[PDB]
Every structure is written in C-alpha cells, then in structure tokens.
Amino acid sequence: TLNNIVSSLQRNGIFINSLIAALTIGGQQLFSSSTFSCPCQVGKNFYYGSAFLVIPALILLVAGFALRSQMWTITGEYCCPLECKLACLRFFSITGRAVIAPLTWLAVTLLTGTYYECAASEFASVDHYPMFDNVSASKREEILAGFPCCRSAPSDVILVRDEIALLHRYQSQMLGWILITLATIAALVSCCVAKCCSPLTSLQHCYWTSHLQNERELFEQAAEQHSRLLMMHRIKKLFGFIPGSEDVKHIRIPSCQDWKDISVPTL
Amino acid sequence: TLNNIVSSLQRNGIFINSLIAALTIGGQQLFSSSTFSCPCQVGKNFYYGSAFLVIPALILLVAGFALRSQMWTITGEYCCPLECKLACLRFFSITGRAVIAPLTWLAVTLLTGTYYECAASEFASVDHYPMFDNVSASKREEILAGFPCCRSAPSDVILVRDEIALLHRYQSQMLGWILITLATIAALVSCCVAKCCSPLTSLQHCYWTSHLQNERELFEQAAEQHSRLLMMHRIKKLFGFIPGSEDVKHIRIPSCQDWKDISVPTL
Amino acid sequence: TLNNIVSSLQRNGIFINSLIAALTIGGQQLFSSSTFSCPCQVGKNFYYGSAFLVIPALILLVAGFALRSQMWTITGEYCCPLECKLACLRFFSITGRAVIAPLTWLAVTLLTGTYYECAASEFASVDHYPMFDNVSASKREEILAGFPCCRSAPSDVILVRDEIALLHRYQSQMLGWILITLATIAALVSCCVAKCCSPLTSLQHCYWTSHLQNERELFEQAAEQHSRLLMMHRIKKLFGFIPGSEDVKHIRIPSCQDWKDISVPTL
Amino acid sequence: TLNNIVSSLQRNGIFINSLIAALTIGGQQLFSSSTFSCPCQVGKNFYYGSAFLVIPALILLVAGFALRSQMWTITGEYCCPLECKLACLRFFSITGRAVIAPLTWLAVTLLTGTYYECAASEFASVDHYPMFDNVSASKREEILAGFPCCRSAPSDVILVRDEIALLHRYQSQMLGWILITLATIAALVSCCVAKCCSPLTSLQHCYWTSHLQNERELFEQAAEQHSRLLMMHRIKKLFGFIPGSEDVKHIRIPSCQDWKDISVPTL
Amino acid sequence: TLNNIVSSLQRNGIFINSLIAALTIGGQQLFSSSTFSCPCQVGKNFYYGSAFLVIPALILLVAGFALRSQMWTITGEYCCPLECKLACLRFFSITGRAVIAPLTWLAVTLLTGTYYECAASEFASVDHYPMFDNVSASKREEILAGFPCCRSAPSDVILVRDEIALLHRYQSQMLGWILITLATIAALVSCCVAKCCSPLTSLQHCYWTSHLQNERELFEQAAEQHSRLLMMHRIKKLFGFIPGSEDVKHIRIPSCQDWKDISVPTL
Amino acid sequence: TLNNIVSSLQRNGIFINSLIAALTIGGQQLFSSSTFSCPCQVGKNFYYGSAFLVIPALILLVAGFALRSQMWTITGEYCCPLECKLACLRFFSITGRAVIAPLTWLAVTLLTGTYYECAASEFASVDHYPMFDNVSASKREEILAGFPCCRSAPSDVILVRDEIALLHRYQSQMLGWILITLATIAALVSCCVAKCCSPLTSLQHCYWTSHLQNERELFEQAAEQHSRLLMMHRIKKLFGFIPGSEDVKHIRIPSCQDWKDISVPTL
Amino acid sequence: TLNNIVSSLQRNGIFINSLIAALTIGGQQLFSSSTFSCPCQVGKNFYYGSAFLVIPALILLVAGFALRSQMWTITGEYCCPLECKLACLRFFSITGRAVIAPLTWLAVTLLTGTYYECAASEFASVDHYPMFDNVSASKREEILAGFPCCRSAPSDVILVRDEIALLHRYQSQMLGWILITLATIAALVSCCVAKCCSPLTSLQHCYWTSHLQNERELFEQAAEQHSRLLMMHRIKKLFGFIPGSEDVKHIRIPSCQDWKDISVPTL
C-alpha cells in the first residue's frame, strides 16, 4: 500500500510544485541569512544587489528547463501539422513545471525586501532634506551608500536613514506583489489559450498523456530485457552456460581468441 | 519494496549529484571553521589563500575522474569510426558526473569569501588614504598584512580595515557568481553539442546505456559463477566430494603430491 | 536483502578507504587533544614533535601491510614469467589498500599544524628582531623554546611569539598540501603504469580477481567440511554412532586403549 | 542471520584484540582516575609508582595465558618430531592472543605519564638550581618528594616543579613510544620466523586450524550425547521408562536396593 | 536463538565470575559510601575497622561455599581410591568458583584504602614530631584518634594529619597489591597441581564434567515425571478419570473412606 | 520461552530471597526517612526506639510463617516414625524461607544505626565530663534526652553530643555485625544438622520435593475439573443442554421446583 | 500467555491485598496533604480530628463488606448443621478480604501522626509549666488550641509547643504500633480457630473453594446462553429467520398484533 500512495503523490503536480516552492523558500532564507553582506561602496552596490536578485532566478529557470528529460527529446525532434501542436503542448507542460522555482525565488526575495534595500540604496531621491544641501555630490554619495549596512551618526542621520529604508521596503514589497499578480494572470490566460488551441477534446488529452508516460516506461523496460538476453547469449557462447542456471554440466574453458571475440560489444 | 526504491534513487543522477554537492558543502564548512588561520606575514599570505582556494578543487576533480570504473576501461581502450564517438559520449557522461564536486567547492568557498580575503589582502589598492602617505613601503606592507586576522589599532585603522574587507568580500562574491554563471552556460552548451554530435537517435541512446550497464553486471556474475564451478571441481578432485553435498560417502585422503597439485591455480 | 547490501558495500573499496580515513582522522583528533603537551626544554623538543609526526605513520603502514592475509601468501610464494607479474599486481593492490592510513595521518596532522609548531620551534630564524641582539645564545634558546606551550612575558614577546607561530603554521600547512599533491600524482602515475604493464586485457582482469576470491572462499569451506567428516568418522569408530543421528540403537563403551587411539589427531 | 555475523566476528581475531585493548584502556583510565594518590614520603614513592606500573601488567599477562583452554591441553601434552613444531605454533598463537593486554596497559599508562611522575620523582637530577645548594640532603629529598602531589611554596618553587614535571613527562612518553616500536618490531619478526619454521604450506595451515576447532567442538557434543544416553538407560533400569516418552504404560516402583544401585555413577 | 546464547553464557565460568566481581565491587562501593563513619574513640577504632575489613569476607566465602548444590552432595558422600580423587577435583572446582567474591571484596576495600585508615589509625608511629613530645600518653592517643574523621586544629596539626593519612593509604594499597599477587600465584599453582594429580586425561575430563551435569538434569526430570504419573494414577483411583482427558464419561463420587485413602502420600 | 524462564526463576530460592531482602531494605529506608521523629522526652524515648527496632521484625516473621500454604497443612497434620521426620524437614524449609525478612530488617536497621541512637540515648554513661558534675539528676536526664533530635547549646555541648552519638553509632553497628555473624553461623549449622538427620539419601530428597509440588498442583487441577463436570451435569439436568454445546435442539424451560432443586449445591 | 498470568495474579489474594493497601496508602497521603486544615477553635478541634480519623475507616469497611457479591448471596441465605459452618467459613473469608483497607487506613494515619495532633491538642496535660499558672482557664484553652496550626509567639511559647507536639506524636505512633500488633495477633488466632472449627480436611477445602468458583461462573454462562437461545427463537417467530443466518430466503413482515406479542418478555 506504500508504493500506491507514493505513485499517487508523484502524479499530483500540485504536490511536486509545493515541494519545489517550499525548498526554494527555505534555500533562499538560508542563503540570505548566511552569506549576504552589503559592500556599501560608491559604485559597487547596485550590482551586488542585482546579482543576488537576478542570477539565481536565471540559474533556477535553466535548471528547471534542462533537467526535464522530455525536453531533450522534444528539442531533438526540433534540432538537427498535428505533430507541431502536440509538441507545443508538451513544451507548454514542461514550461509550466519549470517556471515555478525562479518565480517563487523572485517573489520571496522581493517580499523579504532586504535585497532591494542593498540593490537601489544609491538612487534614493534626496531633494528636500536639511542635511543634504551643503554637502557636495561625492560626499553625498559616500554618506548615502553607508546607510544600509550600518549606523554610526547622530539621531537626525538615523531618522532619515530609517525613513529611506522604509520607503525602499515599501517599494520592494509593492514590486513583489505586482510580480505575483502579473504572473498569476499570465499563467491563467496561458492555460486558457492552451485549452483553446488544443486539437484534442477533453478525453483524448487524458489518453494522450497516459500514452506518452506508458510509452517511455515500457520501451525502457523492453530494451533493458532485450539487451540482457543478448548479453546472456553471448556469455553462453563464451563460457558455455547460462548465468542463471544451476548445476551446469558443461564448462567450456575460453581460448585466447574468444576473449578478442567478447572485447567488442557489436554496438 | 526497499531495494526497488534504493535502485530507483541510485539511477537518479540528480540525487547522486545533490548528495555530492551537499557533502562537499558540509566538508568545506567544517574544514574552514576548523583548520584555517591567516599567517599575516609579508609574503606568505597569497600562497596560504590560493592553496586552500585551488588545491582541494584539483584533488576533488582528480578523485571524481579516477574513482569511476568505466573511465579506466575507456582509457585502456585508448591506452597501449563509430567506436570513437561512443567512447567520447561515455567520457562526456563521466566528466559530467565528476565535475560537480570541484565546481561546488569553488562556488561555496568564494561565496563565503573568507578565503579570498586572506588570499589577496596584499594587492589592496591603497592610494587615496590619509594614513598611508608618509609610511614607507615596507611598513605599509607590514600594517596592510595584519588586517585580515586581527585588529589592535585606533578607530581610523579599523575603519579603513572594514572598508578594505568589504571591498574584498564584494570582489570575492562577484567572482563566485561569475563562475557559477559561466559554468552553467558551459555545461548547457556542452550538453547541446553532445546532443548534436550523437550518431544515435533519441531511442537508441536509452538502449545503449542499458546495454552497457547490463553487460558489466552480467559478465561479473557469470565470471564469478564459472570460476566458482571450476574451483569446486578442483576441490572434488582433491578431497573427493562437493563442498555443497551432504552425507558424503567417499572421503579421499590427500597425498603429498596433490598438495603440490593445488598449490598453483592454473591462472 | 540485508547481506546483499552488506556484501555490495564490502566489495566497494571506496567505502572501506573512506571508513579507514575517517577513523584515522577521528583517532588523530582524539590523540592530539588528549595526550599531547610540549616539553619546552632546550634540546628535547624537536624529537618530541617528530615522534608524534612520524612513528604513528610507520606503525599504521606496517599494520596495513601485515594485517592483509593475501600478503602473507604472496610473501610465502616469494620467501623460502607470468606468475611474477600477477604477483606484482596483487602486491600492488595490497599496497594501494594499505597506504591510505599513514598518508591521511600525515595529511591531517600537518594541516592541523599543532605538531609542526612543537616540532621545529627551535630552528626559528631570529636575525632581525630588536630583543634578540644582546641576549647570549643559551638564554636565546631558552626563551625561544618557551614560546609554543605558554606565554608570560610583556607584549613585545607575545607579538613576536604570535608572528613566529603564524610563520610555522604557514610552513606546516604548505608542507601538508605539497604532500597531498605529490601523493595523489604518484598514485595516479602508479595506477597508470600498472595498467600499462598488465599482461591481461580489461576483461581477463575481472575474471582473475573473481577467481582469486572464489578460490580462497571455496577452499576454506571445503577443507572445513572434509575435516569435519573425518573427525565424525573417528568419533563413530570411538563411540559407535554419528553425532548427528537420533535414537541411536548401539552404544559402544570405550576401552582403555581407544582413548590412546583418539589422543593423536593423525595430523 | 544474527548468529552468522556473531560467529563471523568471533572468528575475527582483530575484533577480539580491539575489544581487549579498548576494555583495558577504559579500565586503566577509571583505575587511575579513581584510586591513585601519591604518598609523597621519603622512600615510599618509587615503589608506589612501580607497583601500579608493573604488577597489573604481570597479572593481565598471566590471565591471558592461563584463561586459554588450549594452553592447558598443550601443557598437559608437555607436563607429566612434527608434533613438537605443531605444538610450538599453537603455543605461539596463544601467546599472540594473550600479549595484547599487558602491552596496551603499559603503553597507555606510559603515554598518560602520570604514573611515571610519581614513580621516579626522587631520582630527579638537581645540580644546577639556585635554591638547592645550601639545603642539606635530607631536607632536599623532603622538598623534592613533595612536588608531585601538591604545591604550597613561592613562585620559584612552582616554576622548578613545573620544569621537573615536564621533563619527567617527556621521559615517560618517550619510553612509551620506544616500547610501542620495539614491541611491534618484535611481533613482526616473530610472525616472520613463525612463517619460516612452519612445516606446513600456506593451505595445510588453514585445514589444520579448522581441524583443531572442529575436533574440540565435535568431541564435546558427542561425549555429551553419549553420557546422556547412558544416564537415560540407567534411569530406564531404575524407574522403568524413558524420560522423553509420553503415556508410559509401566511404572516400576523402586526398591531399597536399586537406590544403592544408582548411588554410584560407575565413573 | 535466545536460549542458545543464554546457555552459552551460563556455561562460561568467566562471565559468571565477572558478574560476581562486578556486583561485589558495586555493593562494596555503596556499602562504604552509605553506612560507614569512624567512631574516633580511644580503644574502639581498630575493631570498627577490622570488622568491615574482615567479617564481610568470611560471610561471602561461606555464602559461596554453602550455596553450591553439588557441595552438599559431596559432603553427604563424605558425611555420615578413584572416587576420592574425583570428589577432590569437584571440591576444587567449587572452591574455585566460590573464592572469587571475598577475594575481590578484600582487594577493592584495600585499594580504596578508606577502611585501613580507620582500622590502624592508633598504631601510628609518632616519635619524631615537634608537637608530640610534651603531651602525655592519654591525650596523645586522644588527639591521634581524632584524625581520621574530622579536622579542627591549626595548620601544623592538619599537616601532620595529612602526612599520617598518606602513609597509611600507601600501606593499605601496598597490602592490597601484595594480596592480589599472592592470590593469583596461589590460584595458578593450585590449578597446576590439580592438573598434575588428575587421573583423567585431557579428554576424559570433558566427558566427566558433561556426565555429571547431564546426570543431575536427567534424574531431576525423570523423577518429576514419575511422581507426576503416580499421583495422576492415584487421582484416577479417587475420582475416576485422568486430569488431562476431555469429555470424561464416568465420574465416581468419592466416599468418606477414600478421603482417608488419599490423606497419606505413601512417601 | 517466557514462562520457561519465569518458572526457572520461581524455582530459584536464591532469587526469591534476594527479592525479599531488597524489598525489605527499600521499605525500611522509606519507613525510616518518612515517619520517624525522636520524642526526646524523659522516659518515653527507649520505648519509641525499641518499638521500631523490634515490632516490625516480629510482624514480618509472623507474616513469613503464616503466609506459607504448606505450613497450614503441616499444622493441620499436627493440630486436632518417618512421617514425623519428613514433616520436620518441611517445617525446616518453610522456616528457612521465612526467616530472611526479619533478619534483614534487623541487620539494616542496626547498620544504619539511627534507631539505636534514639533507642538508648538515656543509658549514656556520663561520669567523666566537666559540665555534668554540678547538675542534678533530673536536669541531667533532661539535657541528655535532648541530644538525639536537635542541638541549640554552646560548642562544648555539641562536642560532647557528637562524641556520645559516635559512641552509640559504633555500638549499634557492632551489634549489627555480631547479629549477622551469629545468624549465618546458626543457619549453617542448622542446615548441617538437617542434612545429618535426613533419613533420605541425596537423590531421594529431590524426588520427594518434586513429589510434593506435583501432588499439590495435580490435585488442584483434578478437583477443579471434577467439580466443573458435576456442575455442568446439574446444569444439563436443569436447562436441558451443555453450556459448551452449540445449536442446541432442545430447551427445557425450568419449573418452580427445579429452582429449589438447584438452590442447594449438595456440598 | 497474557491471560494465564493475569488469572494467576487474580487468584493470589496476597497481590490483591497488596494493591488495596498501596492504593489506600496513596489515597490517604493525597487526602491529608490536600484537604486538611486545623480549625484551632475552642471546642471544635477534637471532632475535626476524630472525623478524619474514624469516618473513612467505617466507610471503607462498609465498602469492603457490601461490594462483595458472595456476601449478598450468603445474607440472602440468612435473610428472609453443616451448611451453617460452611457459610460461616465463607463469611470469614469475605471478612478477611474486606478488613485490610480500614486497618491500613488507621495504621498509616496514626503512624503519620498529623491527625492525632489536631485530634487531642486540647487534652494536653499542662500542670508544671511557668507560663500557664497565672492565665485563666478560658485564655489557657484559647492559647492551647492555637498551637497545632500556627506559631506567632516568643521563643518560650514555641519551645513548649514543640515539646507538646513531640509528646503527642509519640503517643500517636505508639497507638499505631499497638493497633498493628493487636490486629495481627487477632488475625492469626482467628485463622487458627477457623482451621480448628473447619469440618473439612485439608484437601476437601481446596475442592470446595474451586467448586464454589466454578459453580458461579458456569451458571452465569449457561443462563446467558439459554436466554439468548430463547430470545433468538422469539425473534424467529417474529421476523421469520435467525439473526445469525445468511442469505435468508423467507422474510415475514410483522403484523400489528405480533408487536404486542413481543412487547412482553414472558419474564
């Protein structure tokens, strides 16, 4: 009864997507809490933010795309009528499985907001503040870039720093919610257009998916058994018996040529 | 049902790669936290950093290459047409399995950044600082090399030290992300060119891999059983019975010559 | 299914080597943390270091060599053509299994570096220091040998002591990495030359190894059963029945001579 | 499958030797930490040290010798050609099993070194010290014997005490390592000469050992069953039935003489 | 498989002796730590020590002697040629089993030494001490007997008290080691003379021991079954059926005389 | 296999005696630590001590005597030749089982000694003390009886109190050891005289004990089954069927007289 | 094997009595520690003590008497020769089972003594005290009744209070021990006279007890089965089938009269 429920869960795409999202959330939390520290330099801040903000998303998207076995077969069908549309729907299902990880990464890393603070701590619009009128541009950038990591100045500085930080947190969380909403709407309309352009009815689709799955599994098992039988026959030609038999009555000692015979596997 | 899932996991290259990466991450964490200490000498710092940065990567790469049994057979096929391409694809799969460990080692040890600080704490560009103009070159190197390990000087020194350390941490993490991105792109394009140059179709590849695996396993088992039968027959010639039989009726006491007979195994 | 995986692991030389290395690492850690203390005398320091550095390596190497049963049989074949090369390859495999322990001992005890500090705390090159010019040679050695174990002097002394200790730690860890690299290169080229000088092909080697293993096991079991049958027959001659039978109908009481008969085992 | 692995471990002499060594190490640790205290008298110190250093070794050696059943049979063969050499090899195996305990006791109790400090705290060579010139011989011995257990004097006394203690610890640990090395070399050359003087080949030895083991076991079981049958027959002569039968139809009440009959066991 | 190993351990005299020794050690530790307190009177100290030192040893020796069932049968054989020697060897084995407990009690209670301090705290040789010259004999005994339990006097008194206590601890532990060595030597030479005077060979001894054990067990079981059958027959004569039968067809109501019949068991 | 070892332990009188002794020790410890407090009155102390010292011993002895079922049957045989001696031996075995509890109670409560202090704190021989010469007899008793429970007076009083308490503890523990030794000697000589006066040989005794045990058990079971059959037959006469049968075909409704029939059980 | 030991324990009256005594001890401890508080009024103290001292004993005695099923049947035999004596012995056994609870309640609540202090804190004999001569009778009672619960007066008052409390504790514990001894003696002599007046022999008693037990059990089971069969037959007359049958072929729908038929159970 164990493998029954195991396969029932494996079929559930919802469970797999939930597992992927939860693992990405935990990994993002650990990654941020462990190996993140603002450089607070003059020009090397925005890049340090955008790297952690963007690069893991691209990496996880590429990983979700390439790690899917069926994607390789589909590309091989494409790489050097109805088949085109069915391949399009297969590619669509693969993309739907893959997109979950980078999307949840972006969403969580924006809702936490600590990356955006260190990302755009230099573009802060400072125009109506009492302490930022006399200072030159260079020292202005210098004292503005020192806000995110630490604080050491009198109370007015920490007040304006908290204000700027709260503004940037608001901007980050708003961007995160906008991304969530836009992504959900896009996914919904994409599933809708996929249902619209599907040449199969509601029932033929189920049969088609089951057909693809069963095809891959059965061909794997059958090719395995066939090659096993062939190698067993070559072994019987070499030694003179079957590896599975018991109390073998004839044992043919190999000669110096039959080793050369078995050296090549005939591909 | 246990061995079913055990073999199912063993087949999953993703699981094995995840295990290798996690073990390397844990080992790197323990290794760094336990047996690392900056020498903070005048010329013996960059080497102390580059050693921990580089040598374990080379060692783990060589270990991932040599520990693969199939690699030895392939090299023996090479060491003193279609076969060439199939051997190339096998070598490619072995390299794909092996490269994971040193890559993750480099990635984690750069993202942590504590090795790079002690690695290039001497090349620090000190040109626009108030305390480093009057001091001579030798004492400048002396006070610059004492930054990474400890702090003992007044507040200006600790301020410039924190600034230099943050700059170097930024550089280290940027190098780590660049390495990650470049490596992922290289792996993707390499899998692409491997799919392009493959003389087999999408289905022949599965049969070929299953064929190699089954060939190795079946030949091992068959050679074992054959040698066991041969040694059992020599034992029956020595003592006069089969090691597996029960209630043996004839027991031939060995003579002083038959010991010499069994002394050599006939290779 | 238990003994299946047990034997599968036992076959894996990688698992056994990993276990040996981990056990040696743990033992070295406990040994160093428990029963090590620097004597800090004038001439009795370098020996106290080199002992812990060297002697356990030699002991573990001898233990890895002598504890291998096959090594005794090979030496007996040597002690008072093709056979020579096959024995050479067997000796090579035994050496490959054995060398792991002293190598990992040296590697870990050098990477930790605490043994090297107490080993060469007397050869410290003291030529450009402000406090070591007026002092005579004897008191110089006296105050130099008191550095590794403890500290009791003013701040200049502890500063120069920390500098010397860091220099020696750097030297120790560099020597450790050099040893690791040289040993790995030597092992690789030795496996290469072993593959080069092997008179067997890639397939004959597998059969040969399985043959040796099965030969030893089957001969053990067969000799055991034969001697058991012989002793059972002598027991039947003494008492008048078989130790395995039930409801024995005849019981021959032994006489005063048959005890003398069974006193000798006929070798 | 339990008793399979139990017997497999029992055969492994390495496991038994490891267990003996570990138990002796633990016992020595507990014994030293619990019931040891330096008397710090004038002439009663060296004996108090040498007792704990020596006597347990002799006791454990005698225990390892006498507790071996086969040793008693061999001595009986000796006590009031080829047989001599085979008995010599058996005695050698027994000695090899037995020697492990006192050797590890000496090794651990010397490496810990706390016994040697209290053992030779009187032979300390005091000739170049500032406080030991004016004092007479008797008070010199008195203040020298009070060093190991406690300290109560000014700083110069505790300094010279720590120096003497470190010197004696160095001497103790050096003696321990010398003992370890000499013992390992002796054991190796003794196994070598045992292999040299063995009249049996490499294969006859295995058969001989299995023969001895099976002989002892089978004779025990057979003698047990024979005596059981004889006593069962005497019981049937007394009461009139077999202790194993059920629904016995005849019950012979014993008479006043048959009790005298069963009083003696006929030896 | 449980009772197999249970009986295998029960046969091992080494295991039983180890259990007895460990239990006696634990009991001695608890007994000493719980219910021991020095009276520190003038004449009632040596007895309070010697009681705990001696009486438990005698009690445990008598318990080890009398609790052995075979000892009672042997004494009955003695109480109102070859048989004499065999009974002597049986008595020897019983003594060897029994002596372990009082010996280990004495050994542990002497090695701990706290009993000997309170035992001979009055015989202290006080002849060369500065405070014990003017005091009379009575007050001398009074202040000497107050040392073991407590301390309340100035520093010179506590110094001489610690010296006397250390001297007595040394004496106690030396006596303990002497007892251990003498006892082991006596046991060894006694086993030797037992092997010398044994009229049986090495093999007849095993048969004899197995014979004694099997004799006792089989006679117990057979006598039990015989008496059970006899009582079952008397019950059938009383009630009219067998206690083991089912669906009994005849039930004989007992009369007023048959109760008198069953009142006596005919011995 | 459970009930096998359960009955094997139940047969072991040593195990039952150990359990009784341990339970009595624990109960005495709890009883003393919980509900004991010295009254410290003028004449009501010795009784308060002797009660706890004596009464539980008598109670436990009576409980060990009366709770034995066989003792009741033996007394009934006595209450209104060879039989006399056999009954004497049975009574002896019962007494040997019973005496353990009060003896261990006395032993432990004397070795702890806290009961004896409160028992004879009035008979203290006070004749050579500096503070007890001027005081009258009444106040002397008053201040002497206040020693065991509490202390409130100056240091001389607490000193003499500790001295008296230590003297009484010594007396108590000496009495306890004397009781232990005398009791063990008495038990040994009593077992000896029981072996001397036994009319049975060593083997007839085993048969006799097994006979008594089996007699009681078998008669119980047989009487139970007989009465069960009789009541089942009366039930069949009442209702018309057997309580064990199924699908009974005839059901006889009872009449107003048969209830009167079943009202009496015919004894 | 579970129910075997369960019934074996249930038969053991000793186990049931131990359980009852332990439960009563625990309940008394909890009851006293939870809901007891001295009123310390002028006339309402002795009643508050005697209530907790007496009433629970009477309640537990009545509960032990009435809760026994056999007691009801015996009383019904009595309520509106040999039978009289057998009923007397049955009543005796019931009383022996029942009396344990109130006796142990009284014993424990007297040995703890806290109830007796609050019970007779007014009858304190105050005649030779320095502070109780001038005070009138009313205030004397007032200050005497305030002793048990609390203390608030100077040291002389607390001294005389502790003295009175210790006197009353002594009296309480003495009364408890007297009760224990008298009760045990009464129980012993009562069992003796019960054995004396028993018209049955030692063996007829066992049969009689087993007869009573089996009679009750078998009659219960048989009456149950008979009534079940009768109701099943009435159900078959109502509906037309048996409640236990399967695939019933005829189903008789009930009419408006047969409901009236089944309305009465015919008693």
Author numbering:
A (entry chain D), B (entry chain C), C (entry chain B), D (entry chain A), E (entry chain J), F (entry chain I), ...: 4 to 83, 94 to 280
Mind quoting what the paper says about this structure?
In humans, the CALHM family encompasses six paralogs, some of which function as non-selective channels that are permeable to large substances such as ATP. We identified the three paralogs, CALHM2, 4 and 6, to be highly expressed in this organ. The CALHM subunits thus constitute unique modular building blocks that assemble with different stoichiometries into large membrane channels. In contrast to previously described CALHM structures, where the oligomeric state of individual channels was described as uniform, our data show heterogeneous populations with CALHM4 and CALHM6 assembling as decameric and undecameric channels with similar abundance and CALHM2 as predominantly undecameric proteins with a smaller population of dodecamers. Despite the unknown activating stimuli, our study has provided insight into gating transitions of CALHM channels by showing two conformations with either a cylindrical pore of uniform large dimeter within the membrane that is constricted at the intracellular side as in case of CALHM4 and a conical pore that continuously narrows from its extracellular entry towards the cytoplasm as in case of CALHM6.
In each case, we found a heterogeneous, about equal distribution of particles with two distinct oligomeric states. The smaller particles are composed of decameric and the larger of undecameric assemblies, both of which we refer to as CALHM4 channels. Due to the slightly higher quality of the Ca2+-free sample, we continued to use this data for our further analysis unless specifically indicated. The cryo-EM density of the decamers extends to a resolution of 4.1 Å and undecamers to 3.7 Å, which in both cases permitted the unambiguous interpretation by an atomic model. In each structure, the subunits are arranged around a central axis of symmetry that defines the ion-conduction path. Both assemblies contain pairs of CALHM4 channels of the same size related by two-fold symmetry that interact via their cytoplasmic parts. In the plane of the membrane, the dimensions of decameric and undecameric CALHM4 channels amount to 110 Å and 120 Å respectively. The diameter at both entrances of the pore measures about 52 Å and 60 Å for decameric and undecameric assemblies respectively, thus defining the properties of an unusually large channel, which could be permeable to molecular substrates. Even at the constriction located at the intracellular membrane leaflet where the respective N-terminal helices NH project towards the pore axis, the decameric channels are about 20 Å and undecameric channels 30 Å wide. In both cases the pore would thus be sufficiently large to accommodate an ATP molecule, consistent with the notion of CALHM proteins forming ATP-permeable channels.
